[PDB]
Design a protein around this ligand. Structure first.
Ligand SMILES: Cc1ncc(COP(=O)(O)O)c(CN[C@@H](CO)C(=O)O)c1O
Ligand SMILES: Cc1ncc(COP(=O)(O)O)c(CN[C@@H](CO)C(=O)O)c1O
Ligand SMILES: O=P(O)(O)OCCNS(=O)(=O)c1ccc2ccccc2c1
Ligand SMILES: O=P(O)(O)OCCNS(=O)(=O)c1ccc2ccccc2c1
Ligand code: NA
Ligand code: NA
Lengths: 390, 257, 390, 257
């Protein structure tokens, strides 16, 4: 039995070895208690405000929408300490770990952004941080690896499997299965076994809460739609959460289309994958006809999680949220356009969300619409990639 | 069925059961079939066979590489079931248990999976990443097809869990030797709750451990990594591999008598 | 005649060719008028808040001062859009250019940070931006050069002289001397000919204004001292300005000591140079015994301006502000320490200010003192440099 | 003194003055001294000599490289003054003007600088980066040492500036041909305000430009880059350099008669 529902419709659950259930139960109880603790909320708010830099701005594009009836705002998570939305929830999870009396932190990372977030939070809060990262990713993310070590984190390459994110995810769970007594697993997205999809959403919810307050102040009404890229689902559910009960507000998630859905080289399991059971949850995923887990391809390393958060699969199933895909080329064009017309360098992940907003605008230029794109992170990290391609 | 008969027979001889584990298709279909036959001829009372999976998040480096080697041979679930049918056609009484990961069971339908297990002669299925909490559809499908659903009793298991494992489990109760991945009091309470005979697993790699488990009250012991290690260090020497596996298994089984 | 005093004591002035005086007079008049225009102030405030991300946090270090009686706060300019304080004043100068009816922007840059700031502001406000950069710096700052071009800016290598900042400064003035009719020169620091030292200070003044409000709210009193690195003097005067009349508040500027003042390889003209006349102003500078202008050496590319703002030389002369130096090694240690103990990666420039604060703390650990260090920028840009050295 | 005599003499011949500019020490001390002698022998009425400076922010690429070449020869201000003394010892009447940048004048004391100019025989000093607004100490020191402080009259100069330039200037008034760096109505008003004779500079590189300036009312014309260009394209040919410089200067001066 659990205190909270581990499922979102048919999606979710706690598919982990029996030995790990006590850890999940403990975490769920610690989370529920923390959520009712004014002292915990105050500490979390203080860190978000005075350390991370919240609230983040809501920027109105004044050039990219010229000639159309689209008004576009960008929620500036690129300005959060660390350069991405990842920082929000790691601060919350780090506080939870300390609440349970844990002194060690285990984290997985692909692009390394969550790894950096985990390392900075651990350095600030005095936690021993060890990070698992696929060997292939370590090779492609030397900068982030060095930042993690500079901040005192221990980076561990994972050579098993495909040597990428999913493999790092496995190693994290393997480690935790025998160290949960003193170590907390700081999962980086709104996926994995319950209570993680729930915890990550609640610790990223301020994105949507701020956006709502800011858009009401600036436009006097709610947006017609909020748009966010979907790798694992954390930045998107963070933006969506506070708007779920506002039926008039569209919720659009953008998965990576890679070289094109028809090529099979993409990372869009929600709309083009098949439901399976892996990484502790029942959710749509990238898998072979036999049931072997595959990797997600995208020009952006951050949209590499081969599955998707269960709440997104649920929101899609009931028609509350709509999911689409954007290709490498579409994301690249959005990246270049924002740089040149707004002076903001977006993360390639976030560029997928922007690319879809641009499409909504361009396809029907005379359609009056108020859109908000969650700019999940800055793209200084993608400068070289964009450079080599161009 | 086969487990109930095995334990009844072993009990009459006052001996414990020794059950080795190997990954199907490691290092190849042919060599794996030969490895399995050697294990049986050496004294294996039952078998624990793993179907190669891309992400064995419950296994240590040893089994991880066993799965990798099997994939290098192109071993698939379909071929594993062909191997299983052949093994059963050759050995009619030895209990055969599969070590699965949930997605391989869920992939083509849970009910369909257990139906296939029943048709090739499999006796039990242990789904590594399915805790009692998510076990309903798996145990139900298992029972409908006369397959024993294997449950895990952790070292820090509370009374509540003990009762569930004892009531839902069949064939044998898996007694975890420790936390982590592959690489006395609980035993008594399991018997009190009429649980399936207990088999201790994880970390068992020496004869004395097999004797310790049996004396503790367990019906036997399972050994995997210790077995797989013999395979991984004799790849270039097929014959010697079988010879060393035989010596190992014969030594472990002797400890159970 | 001018509307405002071009001098700070004996320092400052308008030492430019006769042909450029009309441009300076026009700029001064446009500035004075803009400063009295509520509409201009509102536009500037809107950009600072909704585009750049102001106000920036004032972060209390909770680990680096343990065991001492020093309480240290960091003014987080590293969280401003662009990653450094440079963004504040470029937004103001870009608005001034438009107020005068100018459509083109000329800028000089050494490390490239101001170049990036100028480019992003120009992209946002629709100005044609051309940036002069010493050829040597272009070679050492490929990332920043690409960011400028991505944002539509034209980067022009300067091969004359030593091919560094001062040479880029010359080229900018050469260009402006024949294009001031349609182009505005966006000077990057609180130096150069009047009215620039004044304009840049006023357009960076919010750093100190915010710090004062924030420290009063958090500690109920003013700091014992505010500390900032000094390259040209903009981030430091931005922090100092609002505190100048608060006699109890110490103002400490930190120049780069390079390999050591005694080696001659440093960038500390205020305290170890000699007053001269160059780049349109009378100020202390790096120069040979004959009077030829030299370059400033520092591990940090940003502290490369070979002279210093006239207001700093004045504040030092009357004893209101104190100036010190910090070596490459001291800055490197401060950089590593902040990364590991606070989870913040500081710019190597800013690390000089932090290094001095650390010295004030360590030299007299039982001295009760409330210090604020201006963290002028983030150091993701210095990761490779710190890596190679280490 | 020398300027007043030169213009008085030129006026009596109804001819304009041609004043070439070169960087002292470019491409070397010896060749520079020879270049200067050739200019004088070719018809130069006066000279404009630049002291190599690290940051000539008022000069275009041509002069920029002239300064660079001089620095390559290790030319310093001290050596420039030695050259100047020698030049004056050889040529007693030709007006000699220096093109300076403020720091070189301020370096060892403004008064001291003009005193040195007077002792070696220099006639005027133009400080490129000192506008009328900052000229007080420079013009005062110049006058105390009988040195003419050269002021710049831009093409878009207002009446206020015209009056200041006419009152503060001596020797000759510098008439800028355009804005930017090195590479009729104002003339009349300057005469109305008793300003020193006007010399047009910047962009003058052809004989007809020299004739146009004189007919416009100017007392003469200055040419720099055009002169320096002849030097920069004959480095490997010292003799031809002097030969081409002579032909150029003789042609320019002829246009002034
Ligand atoms: C800026 C930005 N925007 C979007 C995402 C995608 O994840 P999300 O869907 O959870 O929000 C990431 C994730 N990055 C993951 C996986 O690579 C990490 O380990 O750093 C990101 O860094
Ligand atoms: C983060 C940071 N902190 C400090 C400074 C030094 O200048 P300041 O003294 O004007 O504040 C710089 C300057 N950078 C100059 C000179 O290289 C540029 O052209 O980008 C900086 O980028
Ligand atoms: O000697 P070893 O390798 O340590 O352990 C033997 C494991 N083989 S096994 O019995 O097939 C096996 C494998 C993984 C499991 C995950 C969690 C529940 C129980 C499990 C049983
Ligand atoms: O033919 P050129 O090179 O275009 O121009 C000749 C310049 N030589 S010069 O007269 O020594 C000279 C040099 C620079 C100046 C800066 C601004 C005021 C006037 C100046 C006079
Ligand atoms: Na995904
Ligand atoms: Na300096």
């Amino acid at each position: 039995t659990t205190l909270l529902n581990p499922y979102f419709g048919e999606f979710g659950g706690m598919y982990v070895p029996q030995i790990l259930m006590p850890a999940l139960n403990q975490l769920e109880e610690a989370f529920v208690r923390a959520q009712k603790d004014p002292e915990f909320q105050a500490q979390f708010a203080d860190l978000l405000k005075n350390y991370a830099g919240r609230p983040t701005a809501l920027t109105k594009c004044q050039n990219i929408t010229a000639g159309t009836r689209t008004t576009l705002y960008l929620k500036r998570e690129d300005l959060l300490h660390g350069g991405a939305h990842k920082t929000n929830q790691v601060l919350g999870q780090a506080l939870l770990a300390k609440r349970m009396g844990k002194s060690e932190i285990i984290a997985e990372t692909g692009a390394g952004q969550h790894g950096v977030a985990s390392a900075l939070a651990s350095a600030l809060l005095g936690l021993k941080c060890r990070i698992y990262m696929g060997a292939k990713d370590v090779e492609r993310q030397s900068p982030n690896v060095f930042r993690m070590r500079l901040m005192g984190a221990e980076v561990i390459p994972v050579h098993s499997g495909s040597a990428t994110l999913k493999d790092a995810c496995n190693e994290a769970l393997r480690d935790w299965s025998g160290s949960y007594e003193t170590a907390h697993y700081m999962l980086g997205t709104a996926a994995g076994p319950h209570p993680y999809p729930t915890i990550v959403r609640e610790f990223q919810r301020m994105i949507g809460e701020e956006t709502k307050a800011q858009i009401l102040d600036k436009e006097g009404r709610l947006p017609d739609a909020v748009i966010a890229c979907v790798g694992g689902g954390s930045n998107a559910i963070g933006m969506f959460a506070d708007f779920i009960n506002d039926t008039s507000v569209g919720l659009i998630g953008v998965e990576p289309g890679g070289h094109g859905i028809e090529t099979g080289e993409h990372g869009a399991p929600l709309k083009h994958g098949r439901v399976g059971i892996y990484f502790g949850m029942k959710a749509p995923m990238m898998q072979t006809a036999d049931g072997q887990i595959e990797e997600s391809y995208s020009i952006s390393a951050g949209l590499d999680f081969p599955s998707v958060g269960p709440q997104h699969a649920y929101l899609n199933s009931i028609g509350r949220a709509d999911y689409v895909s954007i290709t490498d080329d579409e994301a690249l064009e959005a990246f270049k356009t924002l740089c040149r017309h707004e002076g903001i360098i977006p993360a390639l992940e976030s560029s997928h969300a922007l690319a879809h907003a641009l499409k909504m605008m361009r396809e029907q230029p005379e359609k009056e619409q108020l859109l908000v794109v969650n700019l999940s992170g800055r793209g200084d990290k993608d400068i070289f990639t964009v450079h080599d391609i161009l | 069925e086969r487990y109930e008969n095995l334990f009844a027979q072993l009990n009459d001889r006052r001996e414990g059961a020794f059950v080795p584990f190997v990954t199907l298709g490691d290092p190849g279909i042919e060599q794996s079939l030969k490895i399995i036959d050697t294990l049986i001829d050496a004294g294996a009372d039952a078998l624990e066979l793993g179907v190669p999976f891309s992400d064995p998040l419950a296994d240590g480096p040893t089994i991880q590489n066993a799965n990798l080697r099997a994939f290098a041979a192109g071993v698939t679930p379909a071929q594993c079931f062909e191997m299983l049918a052949l093994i059963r056609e050759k050995h009619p009484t030895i209990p055969i248990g599969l070590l699965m990961y949930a997605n391989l069971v869920f992939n083509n339908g849970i009910d369909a999976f257990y139906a296939r297990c029943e048709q090739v002669g499999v006796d039990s299925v242990l789904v590594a990443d399915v805790p009692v909490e998510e076990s309903a559809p798996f145990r139900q499908a298992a029972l409908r097809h006369n397959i024993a659903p294997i449950f895990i009793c952790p070292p820090n298991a509370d009374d509540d869990l003990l009762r569930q494992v004892a009531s839902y489990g069949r064939g044998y109760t898996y007694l975890l030797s420790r936390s982590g991945v592959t690489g006395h009091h609980l035993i008594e309470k399991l018997k009190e709750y009429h649980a399936a005979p207990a088999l201790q697993g994880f970390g068992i790699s020496s004869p004395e451990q097999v004797s310790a488990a049996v004396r503790a009250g367990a019906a036997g012991a399972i050994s995997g990594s210790a077995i797989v290690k013999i395979i991984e260090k004799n790849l270039a020497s097929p014959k010697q591999m079988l010879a060393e596996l035989r010596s190992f298994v014969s030594a472990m089984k002797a400890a159970s008598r």
